[PDB]
Design an enzyme around this catalytic site. Sequence first.
Site, PDB file in Angstrom:
ATOM      1  N   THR A   1       0.731  -0.870   0.230  1.00  0.00           N
ATOM      2  CA  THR A   1       0.134  -0.055   0.255  1.00  0.00           C
ATOM      3  C   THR A   1       0.776   1.201   0.164  1.00  0.00           C
ATOM      4  OG1 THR A   1       0.245  -0.179   2.062  1.00  0.00           O
ATOM      5  CG2 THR A   1      -1.728  -1.237   1.264  1.00  0.00           C
ATOM      6  N   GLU A   2      -0.117   2.397  -0.230  1.00  0.00           N
ATOM      7  CA  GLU A   2       0.708   4.033  -0.178  1.00  0.00           C
ATOM      8  C   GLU A   2       1.839   3.983   0.597  1.00  0.00           C
ATOM      9  OE1 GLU A   2      -1.959   7.042  -0.704  1.00  0.00           O
ATOM     10  OE2 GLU A   2      -0.484   8.208  -0.790  1.00  0.00           O
ATOM     11  N   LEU A   3       3.100   4.031   1.439  1.00  0.00           N
ATOM     12  CA  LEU A   3       3.309   5.022   2.607  1.00  0.00           C
ATOM     13  C   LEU A   3       3.049   6.374   3.102  1.00  0.00           C
ATOM     14  CD1 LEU A   3       5.645   3.579   4.781  1.00  0.00           C
ATOM     15  CD2 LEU A   3       7.300   5.317   2.678  1.00  0.00           C
ATOM     16  N   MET A   4       2.529   5.714   4.035  1.00  0.00           N
ATOM     17  CA  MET A   4       2.044   7.137   4.856  1.00  0.00           C
ATOM     18  C   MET A   4       2.978   6.942   6.217  1.00  0.00           C
ATOM     19  SD  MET A   4      -0.813   7.992   3.133  1.00  0.00           S
ATOM     20  CE  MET A   4      -0.345   9.879   3.770  1.00  0.00           C
TER      21      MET A   4
ATOM     22  N   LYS B   1     -11.627   3.790  12.868  1.00  0.00           N
ATOM     23  CA  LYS B   1     -11.262   4.226  13.842  1.00  0.00           C
ATOM     24  C   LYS B   1     -10.093   5.289  13.371  1.00  0.00           C
ATOM     25  CE  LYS B   1      -9.718   0.223  15.841  1.00  0.00           C
ATOM     26  NZ  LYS B   1     -11.188  -0.564  16.455  1.00  0.00           N
TER      27      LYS B   1
ATOM     28  N   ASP C   1      -6.033   1.052   6.342  1.00  0.00           N
ATOM     29  CA  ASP C   1      -6.258  -0.672   6.911  1.00  0.00           C
ATOM     30  C   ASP C   1      -7.439  -0.714   6.013  1.00  0.00           C
ATOM     31  OD1 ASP C   1      -4.226  -0.017   8.531  1.00  0.00           O
ATOM     32  OD2 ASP C   1      -5.724   0.204  10.840  1.00  0.00           O
TER      33      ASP C   1
END
EC number: 2.7.11.1
Lengths: 267, 265
Positions: free
Chosen positions: B96-99, B146, B163
């Site tokens: 997934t795209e990195l945050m 959340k 998530d």
Amino acid sequence: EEEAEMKAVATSPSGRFLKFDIELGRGAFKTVYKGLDTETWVEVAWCELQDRKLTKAEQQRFKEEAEMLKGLQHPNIVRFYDSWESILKGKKCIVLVTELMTSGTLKTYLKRFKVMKPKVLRSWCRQILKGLQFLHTRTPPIIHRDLKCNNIFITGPTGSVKIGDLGLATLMRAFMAPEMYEEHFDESVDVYAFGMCMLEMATSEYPYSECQNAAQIYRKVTSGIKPASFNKVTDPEVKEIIEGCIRQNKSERLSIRDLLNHAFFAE
Amino acid sequence: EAEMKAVATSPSGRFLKFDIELGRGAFKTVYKGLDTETWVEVAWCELQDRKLTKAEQQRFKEEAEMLKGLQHPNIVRFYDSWESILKGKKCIVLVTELMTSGTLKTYLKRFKVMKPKVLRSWCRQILKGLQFLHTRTPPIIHRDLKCNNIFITGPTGSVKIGDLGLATLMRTFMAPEMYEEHFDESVDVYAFGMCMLEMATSEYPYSECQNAAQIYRKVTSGIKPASFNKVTDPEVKEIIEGCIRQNKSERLSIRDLLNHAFFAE
């Protein structure tokens, strides 16, 4: 009927039933005591349950259930007499009073008689089916939500059977939205239960014995793998019924009338 | 400057795993990776086994195919996924795209209080994201919204719901129908309300209740958290209420919330 002293330790709010300090059995948060119906002079069952931190809405629901249940009378439903809220020991208890069953459950029966003859399973099963149809055709329809061999009680070894533990479903019940705690049931869940019961009676084996933990069973069931017991079924006509009942897709499962309109279950 | 000091590769070859851990959750572990195609760095989430059946694996696969397709500002991008054995156990790998700029949770922690202008903008954005997911076809329900899975581009940037796959993957004798989970859009509308409330009060909702069960009673009985009452802006307060109505059919819809005044300009 002759005469009697009381020497009872407590009484129903109605005054109808008396409790003796004669414990009969000790289950979950349940304790059954012997008791008397002053009106009929018949020995009765005094179920001291425990505190299930009953929300309150559900309290109302239970009361509404109780009424119905008290009103119920069938040759195969252990009659329910009364219930009320009490503070025994130090904890908020619910007391139930029901037809006293003396001859043990199918399970106790199985542990003793070891195996079961065709004639028995044929008759006792029919009897259960009859009972269910009765509950389901109540208005509104009442769903056991918890049929098992140990709450199917026998009148006599040579006698009949009756469905018990009547209200216990409601009584014994991240952050997520409320509607996530909603349990959705219907009649067919009872058919599923019934099949499992019939199977255990037929094989003298608890379904999914093979399994080792809860999560294992989840897989098998949700993937529709049948219990190892299933294969051990001898009579193929029985095997039919059992299968038809335990069908994974709810909308493919048999119905009560259909089971009763089955040949095995014909009179 | 196109080096290949890695430990693992996606089946496709597109993505490379570096042996540097970026976090270690429950039955997961996140390592840094590389989209050798765009040359952009990425998150490589080695999960763990979830005692999965197999039918559900198929379902998840289908779900995940839907996910690869999605492009919206207020959603963490999802790239690739596949099955793998690490150590002795079957694991599922997610790309997934990195945050890197944390979550709403890490934001409240650092800045303590949220400015109402910010709340207005970001909450607006979460709604926009959910509306995108809910209008996918099939509709996509999060189930597990959340604050520590709402990620920000940066303190001056914006929000992306994360998530994404974990609803299904992590979950989230009795008849099989009993294992069925019954969720709809409102379940997320509800969870959004909790997000917004946390943001308004910088307190985790139901911080009060020590026992997990104590919470059950309140929720099931229809009792709002202590922190509900601590909402000082009346317009915010109304929205939170309309979101956390215990009666699911009474709760507002996404559209309602977007059409509202608070969320505008």
